[PDB]
Structures are given as structure tokens and as C-alpha cells.
Amino acid sequence: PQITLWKRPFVTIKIGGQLKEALLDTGADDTVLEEMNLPGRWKPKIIGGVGGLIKVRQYDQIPIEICGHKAISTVLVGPTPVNIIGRNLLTQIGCTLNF
Amino acid sequence: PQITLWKRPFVTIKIGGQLKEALLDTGADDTVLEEMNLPGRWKPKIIGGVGGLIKVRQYDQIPIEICGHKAISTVLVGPTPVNIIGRNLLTQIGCTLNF
Ligand SMILES: CC(C)CN(C[C@@H](O)[C@H](Cc1ccccc1)NC(=O)O[C@H]1CO[C@H]2OCC[C@H]21)S(=O)(=O)c1ccc(N)cc1
Incomplete structure (x- = not known):
């Protein structure tokens, strides 16, 4: 699908x-x-x-379910104010920007 | 256009x-x-x-053009390490995330 950006794009x-x-x-x-x-x-x-x-812990080859995809990704764990999905995982689920 | 996320999504x-x-x-x-x-x-x-x-300065109603799409938008200025286009402007140019 498509996600607009009037709201913060949070996913489970x-x-x-x-x-x-x-x-x-x-x-x-x-x-x-x-x-x-x-x-x-x-x-x-x-x-x-x-x-x-900031200092983070880097975990490799961690399974993550996101937007109907079963992905495997590096995850960094540390004192971020918000959980963030970066391009390492966005590419893996075929996410793109379109305007 | 459509922008892949294998590279950082910089635009002029x-x-x-x-x-x-x-x-x-x-x-x-x-x-x-x-x-x-x-x-x-x-x-x-x-x-x-x-x-x-960080502390930034908020300027309202500033004309900004991105890839031929013109907007009049709020622009924050301050000690960010990189120029960032946020959701307030992405929405104005019709940008969405697509899976
Ligand atoms: C943490 C986010 C909720 C908010 N940020 C945007 C985010 O995309 C920044 C944008 C960003 C990009 C580069 C440098 C500084 C900030 N990226 C970032 O912190 O990513 C880090 C994890 O991946 C690494 O890759 C880049 C830095 C690391 S932010 O830069 O702090 C920000 C917050 C509020 C506004 N209005 C504008 C920007």
C-alpha cells in the first residue's frame, strides 16, 4: 500500500x-x-x-516482522528517544518514496 | 518521481x-x-x-522549491549536521511512502 505523511508514520x-x-x-x-x-x-x-x-549495541541477523514482511536485519539498541526503522530495513521490504 | 532507499535520499x-x-x-x-x-x-x-x-530558529511562510514542486512552508534553521526536508514539506509536494 501507500502511507501519507500528515501524521508520523508509525508501524507495528x-x-x-x-x-x-x-x-x-x-x-x-x-x-x-x-x-x-x-x-x-x-x-x-x-x-x-x-x-x-550515543553508544548502541549492534545485533546482527535479528528476525523482524514489519508491514507483512518477514525480514532479517541488523538492529542497534540504545538511548534513542523514538524507535526508528532506517533504510537498512526499508530497502529490504521494498519501501520507496514517491511524489 | 520514485526514489529507492538503497542510497540516502538527497535531492536538490x-x-x-x-x-x-x-x-x-x-x-x-x-x-x-x-x-x-x-x-x-x-x-x-x-x-x-x-x-x-538542539535550538533552532523557526521562519514561517518561506518559499521553497523541490524538484519543480513549489511550496510555502515553515523552515527551521540551526546546527543540524545535514539539511533535512521534513513531513511539513513532504506533504505539500505530495510525497508518500509506498510498499
Ligand atoms: C530521530 C528522528 C525521530 C528525528 N530526526 C530525523 C532522522 O531522520 C535523523 C536525520 C539525521 C541524519 C543524519 C544526521 C543527523 C540527523 N536520522 C538519524 O538520527 O539517524 C541516525 C540512525 O541512523 C543513522 O543514520 C543518520 C544518523 C543516524 S532529527 O534529525 O532528530 C529531526 C527532528 C525534528 C525535526 N523537525 C527535524 C529533524
Whole structure:
């Protein structure tokens, strides 16, 4: 389908056995979620946004259900103010911008 | 047009006779541009994202052109690391997300 942008484009995602709301964010390179538990190995990384840098945990090959797709993605976990779906996952579900 | 998200979605914008590169960002409520001079009244605004908050200047009713689509829109100016086109302008040019 098609999603307009008068409202913040939140979608429900299923990850780590949890249901979460996350913002579809074409301005994000990466998918970044608030503090949560995920299984498996991780490595720490620094990322930066509008306000400066934060430390995140990088989990690879994490299954995510989003917009009717069964995806597998890298997920960063850390102190973001909002769960964000970045282009790494938007590309994987065939999402595009159109005007 | 239609824009894939395998690369960052930068487009050329025209504002006040200036050409700039800006990110089409569905995660941003409002357009925010790197430090520049604009005419007319402004008021301070706080915005927030990854890494914290920044103070910006809010200018209303500024003409901006994107890929031949003209809008009159609110433009925030301040210490963003990148020029960002937000939902307030994306809606005015008819931009949607498509799966
Ligand atoms: C965190 C979002 C809810 C809001 N942001 C827009 C977002 O697209 C920024 C836009 C952005 C882009 C580059 C640099 C700074 C901000 N991207 C971002 O923080 O992504 C980070 C995770 O992926 C990495 O890729 C880029 C930075 C990392 S924001 O830049 O803070 C912002 C907030 C409010 C307004 N009006 C305008 C912009």
C-alpha cells in the first residue's frame, strides 16, 4: 500500500517476541530501538544524530516482522528517544518514496 | 518521481535563490536546514533526536522549491549536521511512502 505523511508514520513491528511501535524514517541509515533484550552476540558502536552521539549495541541477523514482511536485519539498541526503522530495513521490504 | 532507499535520499532544493542538497526525511516532523540567513520574523524552537536536543530558529511562510514542486512552508534553521526536508514539506509536494 501507500502511507501519507500528515501524521508520523508509525508501524507495528514484532521483534524479540515483543510488539513495538516504530517510526518509518528515510533519514536514518540504521534501525535503532530503545532499550530491549535481544538474543545472541552483539558489539558496541557509536552513532550520531541531530543532537550528537550515543553508544548502541549492534545485533546482527535479528528476525523482524514489519508491514507483512518477514525480514532479517541488523538492529542497534540504545538511548534513542523514538524507535526508528532506517533504510537498512526499508530497502529490504521494498519501501520507496514517491511524489 | 520514485526514489529507492538503497542510497540516502538527497535531492536538490531551491530556497531564497540558493541551491542546496537536502535529505528527504519521513522521520522529521519539520524541515531543518544548516545555518543560513533568511528574511522576516522568526521564533526559537527546540527539536530533539538521536543524541539530544538542539535550538533552532523557526521562519514561517518561506518559499521553497523541490524538484519543480513549489511550496510555502515553515523552515527551521540551526546546527543540524545535514539539511533535512521534513513531513511539513513532504506533504505539500505530495510525497508518500509506498510498499
Ligand atoms: C530521530 C528522528 C525521530 C528525528 N530526526 C530525523 C532522522 O531522520 C535523523 C536525520 C539525521 C541524519 C543524519 C544526521 C543527523 C540527523 N536520522 C538519524 O538520527 O539517524 C541516525 C540512525 O541512523 C543513522 O543514520 C543518520 C544518523 C543516524 S532529527 O534529525 O532528530 C529531526 C527532528 C525534528 C525535526 N523537525 C527535524 C529533524
